[PDB]
Design a protein around this ligand. Sequence first.
Ligand SMILES: Nc1ncnc2c1ncn2[C@@H]1O[C@H](COP(=O)(O)OP(=O)(O)NP(=O)(O)O)[C@@H](O)[C@H]1O
Ligand SMILES: Nc1ncnc2c1ncn2[C@@H]1O[C@H](COP(=O)(O)OP(=O)(O)O)[C@@H](O)[C@H]1O
Ligand SMILES: [Mg+2]
Ligand SMILES: [Zn+2]
Ligand SMILES: [Zn+2]
Ligand SMILES: [Zn+2]
Length: 646
Amino acid sequence: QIVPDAATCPACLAEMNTPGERRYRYPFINCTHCGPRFTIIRAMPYDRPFTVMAAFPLCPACDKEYRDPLDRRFHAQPVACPECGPYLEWVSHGEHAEQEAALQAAIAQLKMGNIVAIKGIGGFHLACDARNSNAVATLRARKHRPAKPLAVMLPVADGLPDAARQLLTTPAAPIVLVDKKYVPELCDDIAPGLNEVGVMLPANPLQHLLLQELQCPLVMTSGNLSGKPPAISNEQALEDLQGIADGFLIHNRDIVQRMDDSVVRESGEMLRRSRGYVPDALALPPGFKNVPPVLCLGADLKNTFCLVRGEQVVLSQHLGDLSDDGIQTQWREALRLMQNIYNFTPQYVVHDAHPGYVSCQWASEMNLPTQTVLHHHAHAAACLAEHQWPLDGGDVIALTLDGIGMGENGALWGGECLRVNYRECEHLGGLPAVALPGGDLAAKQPWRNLLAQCLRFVPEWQNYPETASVAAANWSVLARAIERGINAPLASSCGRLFDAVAAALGCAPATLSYEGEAACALEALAASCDGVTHPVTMPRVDNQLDLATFWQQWLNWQAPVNQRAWAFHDALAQGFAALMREQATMRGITTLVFSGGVIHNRLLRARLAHYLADFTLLFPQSLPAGDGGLSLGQGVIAAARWLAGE
Ligand SMILES: Nc1ncnc2c1ncn2[C@@H]1O[C@H](COP(=O)(O)OP(=O)(O)NP(=O)(O)O)[C@@H](O)[C@H]1O
Ligand SMILES: Nc1ncnc2c1ncn2[C@@H]1O[C@H](COP(=O)(O)OP(=O)(O)O)[C@@H](O)[C@H]1O
Ligand SMILES: [Mg+2]
Ligand SMILES: [Zn+2]
Ligand SMILES: [Zn+2]
Ligand SMILES: [Zn+2]
């Protein structure tokens, strides 16, 4: 059995720490109870000639340890000392060094405020001093990342809430998101515009060394240009990162699988599922048995694939966006290793119903029978699967809220009420479909969504201060294209409605640098309000929300901006609750399901749960609510269809 890659045990820490010990300050110390698992395997089974440790035979003194039944190093396939093992290597613009000299080289570079590349378990990290403004602004520049929040590694978990200290210290050692008030030492460029900071603890022996001598918080971000795959080779780090890193702290141990840090909320909610959780299987729900091997390709962004067989499913690591170049290489390598570990050969492939997805291209190359699942049906079934809803459990009403996914018959959906079970998805209602002006540009420029909402729903909209930067431009050319349907497809998107509201409040840059940026901003603004009495509503008209009444009330309710943002969240939840109540009660349904990337918004769930207390409510928890949980939803729908004999 291979278990997930795991955080250094207290025991290995104690040995690396004790003077005169053979592995004192050795940065590759591992044992039978911690260390790289999944990341160091070239093939099955889990024995040293088929790990990366074949470049290192074991010296005489690491032969009574590995061979020893009493030792906590009995069949640690990667275990080595400084005599026989990998050793650190420092590389700089006309410098070089090795071992202890290399570790000190990096420490000194970090201390002087520089960016260093450090080889971790699952890839490389870029690090600097997280207190040092100059250094953060520069890392942002070089990595191209102008706003997306940086995770930060802390020496200890002192001063954090109990719930976070608990998660931070698990063998998985994820990044945990916590209120930024708890970490005053961070410069303001770490998570600008947001209320949460992602923190982590040292989880690998090198990280423990670095932090023990640095005793300050460090940025720890992925070793790559934004929207390019993490370099995994020393060779590729040194090439890809030359203009970013001031220095390289590398090593001659190969990494064989890309494995990003996992990200959870202090609440326990899973956001990104990789290091520490993969490659654990999950049990399929009651009634799911004897399922043939099916490969589920997942979503185009935040991608994971899934392998379904028998009574279990296994999700891959976060692979990211599949429109990136070199992501297919890492994808296929992860699939190769996962199929080899599970002796898995697919007989079927399942993929998204969207014909323009990269994933749907790869499927047709496979020579297996293929089938299609609606994006929003997959989101909803993924949530039902996590809650172990039985195969014959009965219909639910689902609310699936996201940016965009392809719906029935070509429609663009992202804010829908559905009747679902594992085989069927019937669309019932939701947000009105509104144009995306300039197609792909609508997700980058929130003001385009505000314009589209105003043209549809707001009389004399040019007279509101909220619309002033749009009204001052020559907006009629784009309005003429909208009316003619030129690159302005209709979408009932919850994510785009969030962007319209954020444009109206001015809480985001006019043009965004990352996906979901305006919505995270608006949520951060609203979360600073403790709740407010307000008159803004989103009433139900038949099976849709009445956005004209929404805009007229919301635009005319002057209040501090945090209260305006809170009112929007509240009125949105109240209107969807009203819709789901009518649909579920008149069908005899007592369970409601919530899914889609928007359902990561904590204030939205809090308000939905406040207004839907008359129902049983199923929210995602152990898998991401967004696209990273999508392959699992595809796999349970495929399975249930087969189990029914269709
Ligand atoms: N305050 C925060 N709020 C939400 N998410 C956070 C926060 N801090 C860190 N994270 C997550 O930590 C992750 C690390 O890097 P990410 O930067 O997306 O992928 P990468 O492959 O490592 N590099 P890149 O491709 O540029 O993104 C991102 O998912 C962040 O969203
Ligand atoms: N806190 C939030 N509040 C509202 N919307 C959000 C929030 N976080 C993310 N989103 C939205 O959800 C989208 C991600 O949803 P997901 O289902 O993962 O992907 P997609 O929309 O690409 O199918 C983001 O682009 C953004 O539109
Ligand atoms: Mg503190
Ligand atoms: Zn150990
Ligand atoms: Zn040795
Ligand atoms: Zn989605």
